[PDB]
Design a protein around this ligand. Structure first.
Ligand code: S17
Ligand code: S17
Ligand code: CL
Ligand code: K
Ligand code: K
Ligand code: K
Ligand code: K
Ligand code: ZN
Ligand code: ZN
Ligand code: ZN
Lengths: 368, 375
C-alpha cells in the first residue's frame, strides 16, 4: 500500500529564536540559548531518521502545497488569517499574539506549507491514491483555536485538513485523534459546536494549556458529545495510553464512524520528553499507531493521515516517530536503541489512578 | 553593597567543570548502525551546569558568596571513598591518548580527564574543609562531573568519583567528625554513595529518587546497609509524577526525622535538579520553589542539629532552561538573598505535583518504620 510522506525543507527552518520557550529575557536573567525547546531540529532528526533508516524507500514522498486562504478559513477566522499575514509582513516578523509564538518575516510561507502538507496528504489518501500517510509538518497546529495562534501553533493543521475533507472531499464525518501530550485546545475550539468532526485529545492533565482539557469539555449544541478529552496523570506510560486507546479512543472512533481519521501525532508523551511527565516509549507509540491504523482499516477503508504535532526529545523523538512510520509501511528495520534503558523505568503497569482517569471517560461514549 | 545579612557562604565553580567532554552522543554514544544521529548537545553536556554558574553570577548572587577555589582531590582523598583499583583505572583511562571508556560503556574521560574528576571531588572537599573550620557557615560546590553513581570500585553513570563520599571521607578521617549525613535528592538513586557507606554507620546515606529510574533494579527501601551500617542507608523511591508535595512530604516525614535521629556533625547534600518539572531524564515535577523549600528545610535542619554545617554538592539535572533557576533557588536559601523570581513559575505552577497523591503518600510511609533503627 502506498504510504504518503510529507517533509518540506522549510519545516526545519522555522525560527525559534534565542530563548528557551519564552525569549531570552535579560532582566529575568534567562540566558540566551541556541536550542530553543521548540527548535525545528527535533523534527528534522525524525525526518533524517526516516531517510537514514531506509523507511523513505517504502514511502511515497508527497510535496506540500501551500494552504490557500480558502483552506485556512475552513478552520480559522478571517481575522486570524489577516493577523498572521500582518505579523509575517512585519520587517522582522513578530508576536503572533501570545508573546511566545513567533513568526519571522515571511514565516507565513512555512505555516501555509505545514497546513498544506496535511491537506495534500489528506487529499491524496482520500482519492485512494495513497492508503495512508505521515505529514511531518512544522510548525505544529493543535493549540491554534479558530481565532488565534498559540503554543507554537500558527494554524491548526489537522483542522485545516479535516475542514478540507469535509468541504472539498464531501466527507460527512472526520475524526481527529490527538495524542500529543498537551491538550488540543485549538482543535477542540474549532470543532466545538460541530458534530461532523469528532475531536479526541489524550493529554497530561493541565500540562499545557493551563486550565484546559477537562473531560467535562464535551462541545456544545449539535457538537455536544463530539469532543472527548482524556486527561491523564503525570507518569502515565504505555499501559495507561493503550488502556485509553482500548477503552475510549477506538470505541469512540467505532461509534462515530468517521470517513477519515486524522492523528495529531506528537511524541511529547515520550519517556524522555522535557515538556511533559509521561512515560510512553517508541513501542507505546508503535502500538498506538498500529491500533489506530487497524481501526481505520476496519471502519473507514484504511483512510488515516498522521500529522506531526509536538515532541521535544531530539534523542528519542526520531525513534518514536520512526516506530509510527514503520506501522504505516509495515517495514520494521530498526530497534529502538533506548528500549533497554527505558524498559525498567515503569509505565507498563496500568496504575489505579490511571485506570480511574480513563474510566471517567467511558460513560461519554454513550453520547456518540 | 557591603553590609551582608548572611555568614560566609562558600561557592565552588572551576572553569574545567564546564569543559567535561561529553562527546557526540545523546546518552550512549551516537551509533551509526542503530541510526542514532550524532548531536551537538549530549543530555549531560556541561552547559547545563555552566548556565547555573552564569546565573549565580548574572543574578548578583555571586556577590553574596565567598568563591572557594577547588583543589585537586589527592589519591589519599579519593581512596577514602574508592578502591586503589578504581583510582588506578581512572589514572589508566585518563592517560590513554584520547582517554576512553571508564567501564560502563557510557562514562567517558578524555585524555587528562582525571584532572577534572579530581577538581570536582576536590571542590566538595575544599568547601567541606572550610565549612568545618568555621570559616564558612555553609556552601554550594557546583561541581562536574557528578558523583553519586560511582561506587567504591567503579565509575558509573557519568560519575568518575563519588564527590560527596570523598568529602564525607575527608570529614571523617581528616576533620575527625564521627557522623556525616549525605542527603541525595538528585532524581536518580545514589547507588554509588549507598555502596561506599553500606557497612558503615558513621555516614548516613539517604537517597530520594524516582523508583527504578536509574540505575535499573536499584534503590529499593529494603537496601538498608549491612553489619554495623545496617539501618544507615535510607532509600525513598517515589513514583513518576511526584512533585513538590511528595518531595516535601518525603522531607518532613522521613529525611528531616532521619537527620534529627542520626545527629550528623555535617550534612552534605547531593544536590541534583533532575527531579525538576522540565527535566528529560526523569518524570518528576519539582519546581524551583520545591527545591527552595527542600533547601530551606535542610539548611534549617543543619542549623538545628550541626551548627548550620551544610555543604551542597552538585549532582545531576538536564534542563539547561530550568536547572539554573532550581540551582539559584537553593543558593538563595543559603545567602537569604532572594533577588530573582523563577520566570517559569506561572507556566509550571498549574501543571500539578503540589497535591500529595495517595500513591506518593504511601511510598513515603513505607520508609517511616526505618527511622526507628537510626542510632
Ligand atoms: C541508549 O542507551 C542508554 O540509554 C545508555 C546505556 C544504557 C543502556 C541500557 C541500560 Br539498562 C542502561 C544504560 N544509558 C545511559 O547513558 C544512562 C545514563 C544515566 C543518566 C543518569 C545520570 C544522572 O543524572 N544520575 O544521577
Ligand atoms: C516562561 O514562560 C513560558 O514557559 C511560556 C509562556 C507561558 C507562561 C505562563 C503560562 Br500559565 C503559560 C505559558 N510557555 C509557553 O508558551 C508554553 C508553550 C509550550 C507548550 C506547548 C508545546 C506543545 O508541544 N504543544 O502540544
Ligand atoms: Cl546580604
Ligand atoms: K466536534
Ligand atoms: K492531545
Ligand atoms: K552508611
Ligand atoms: K537520589
Ligand atoms: Zn505537545
Ligand atoms: Zn550578601
Ligand atoms: Zn541524576
Amino acid at each position: 500500500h502506498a504510504i504518503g510522506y510529507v517533509w518540506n525543507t522549510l519545516y526545519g527552518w522555522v525560527d525559534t529564536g534565542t530563548g528557551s520557550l519564552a525569549a531570552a529575557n535579560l532582566t529575568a536573567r534567562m540566558q540566551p540559548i541556541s536550542h530553543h525547546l521548540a527548535h525545528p531540529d527535533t523534527k528534522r532528526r525524525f525526518h533524517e531518521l526516516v531517510c537514514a533508516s531506509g523507511q523513505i524507500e517504502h514511502l511515497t514522498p508527497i510535496a506540500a502545497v501551500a494552504a490557500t486562504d480558502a483552506d485556512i478559513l475552513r478552520a480559522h477566522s478571517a481575522a486570524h488569517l489577516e493577523n498572521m499575514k500582518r505579523v509575517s509582513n512585519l520587517p522582522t516578523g513578530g508576536d503572533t499574539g501570545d508573546g511566545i509564538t513567533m513568526m519571522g518575516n515571511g514565516g507565513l510561507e512555512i505555516a501555509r506549507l505545514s497546513a498544506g502538507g496535511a491537506v495534500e496528504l489528506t487529499r491524496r489518501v482520500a482519492t485512494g491514491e495513497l492508503s495512508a500517510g505521515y505529514a511531518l509538518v512544522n510548525p505544529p497546529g493543535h493549540h491554534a483555536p479558530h481565532n488565534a495562534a498559540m503554543g507554537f501553533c500558527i494554524f491548526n493543521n489537522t483542522s485545516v485538513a479535516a475542514g478540507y475533507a469535509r468541504a472539498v472531499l464531501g466527507m460527512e464525518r472526520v475524526a481527529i485523534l490527538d495524542w500529543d501530550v498537551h491538550h488540543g485546545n485549538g482543535t477542540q475550539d474549532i470543532w466545538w459546536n460541530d458534530p461532523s468532526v469528532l475531536t479526541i485529545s489524550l493529554h497530561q492533565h493541565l500540562c499545557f494549556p493551563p486550565d484546559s482539557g477537562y473531560s467535562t469539555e464535551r462541545g456544545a449544541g449539535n457538537g455536544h458529545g463530539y469532543n472527548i478529552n482524556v486527561p491523564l496523570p503525570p507518569g502515565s506510560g504505555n499501559a495507561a495510553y493503550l488502556h485509553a486507546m482500548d477503552q475510549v479512543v477506538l470505541p469512540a472512533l467505532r461509534a462515530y464512524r468517521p470517513q477519515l481519521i486524522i492523528v495529531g501525532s506528537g511524541f511529547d508523551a515520550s519517556m524522555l520528553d522535557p515538556l511533559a511527565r509521561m512515560m510512553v516509549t517508541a513501542d507505546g507509540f508503535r502500538q498506538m499507531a498500529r491500533r489506530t491504523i487497524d481501526c481505520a482499516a476496519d471502519i473507514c477503508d484504511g483512510r488515516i493521515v498522521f500529522v506531526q504535532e509536538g515532541g521535544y526529545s531530539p534523542h528519542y523523538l526520531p525513534f518514536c516517530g520512526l516506530a509510527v512510520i514503520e506501522e504505516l509501511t509495515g517495514v520494521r528495520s530498526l530497534p529502538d536503541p533506548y528500549h533497554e534503558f527505558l524498559a525498567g523505568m515503569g509505565g507498563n503497569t496500568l496504575l489505579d489512578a490511571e485506570r480511574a482517569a480513563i474510566e471517567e471517560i467511558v460513560p461519554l461514549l454513550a453520547d456518540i
